């Protein structure tokens, strides 16, 4: 989870993606005003990580920063080529561009993972 290096394009930031994890550790019993706020804050973080890790897990990446998925690219989601996607468009810009096809992408990834799981058992007999 990184903030900083948001201005740079994909080609610059991806090299330092390693650094985002690399440099740092990365990522109440009171009814007073401050104490309740602390309880809510703790729950919010745990819940958020688990939602993120639950979404990551279903596609079978299992806690890895770059995950390759065998899902072909659909020309309805986007048109631009690799150079003009990874050379002059920031991550925020791209995620705003393809914000209408995240649900379908997630569903396709989950279905592909399930199909790959089924195809593995057959090989083992």
């Amino acid at each position: 989870g990184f903030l900083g290096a948001a201005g740079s394009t994909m080609g610059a930031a991806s090299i330092t993606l390693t650094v985002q994890a690399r440099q740092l550790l990365s990522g109440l019993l009171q009814l007073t005003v401050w104490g309740i706020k602390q309880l809510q804050a703790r729950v919010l973080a745990v819940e958020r990580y688990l939602q993120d890790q639950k979404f990551l897990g279903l596609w079978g990446c299992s806690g890895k920063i770059i995950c390759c998925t065998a899902v072909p690219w659909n020309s309805s989601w986007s048109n631009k080529t690799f150079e003009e996607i990874w050379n002059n468009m920031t991550w925020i810009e791209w995620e705003r561009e393809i914000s209408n096809y995240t649900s379908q992408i997630y569903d396709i990834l989950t279905i592909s993972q399930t199909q790959q799981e089924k195809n593995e058992k057959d090989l083992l007999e």
Partner: nanobody, 130 residues
Framework: QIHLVQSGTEVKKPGSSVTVSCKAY?????????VNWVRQAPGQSLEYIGQ??????????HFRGRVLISAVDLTGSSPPISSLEIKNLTSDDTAVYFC??????????????????????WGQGTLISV
């Protein structure tokens, strides 16, 4: 709410200059807003001239070197004002004009994209014929 008012109508002759100014009642500032100048046509579709966006003036490739755009935001007594000046006036300039604004506070809304945006609130318009 939001309301736009421009200047009055003018009848002129070629080889002159004329300016129309819109006064927006509802725009807190032009820093997080944007003004888009669009010229309707006598019978044709609407066209684009230019804009002021984060106090960075610009114009279309067919109006570069002629049209000028300036704007002043909230004052003590007056609301934000933006203006368009037509230089070297010609017969083809016989059309209505509009000053339009769309909000730019959130990136994720979908009313703007890298400076090329929609047109949310439209003024009444000022017919100009020569």
């Amino acid at each position: 709410q939001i309301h736009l008012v421009q200047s009055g109508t003018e009848v002129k002759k070629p080889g002159s200059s004329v300016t129309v100014s819109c006064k927006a009642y509802g725009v807190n500032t032009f820093g997080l807003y944007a003004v888009n100048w669009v010229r309707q046509a006598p019978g044709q579709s609407l066209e684009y001239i230019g804009q002021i966006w984060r106090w960075k003036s610009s114009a279309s490739h067919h109006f570069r070197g002629r049209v000028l755009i300036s704007a002043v935001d909230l004052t003590g007594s007056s609301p934000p004002i933006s203006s368009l000046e037509i230089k070297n006036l010609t017969s083809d300039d016989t059309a209505v004009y509009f000053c339009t604004t769309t909000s730019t506070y959130d990136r994720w809304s979908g009313l703007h994209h890298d400076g090329v945006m929609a047109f949310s609130s439209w003024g009444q318009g000022t017919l100009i014929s020569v």
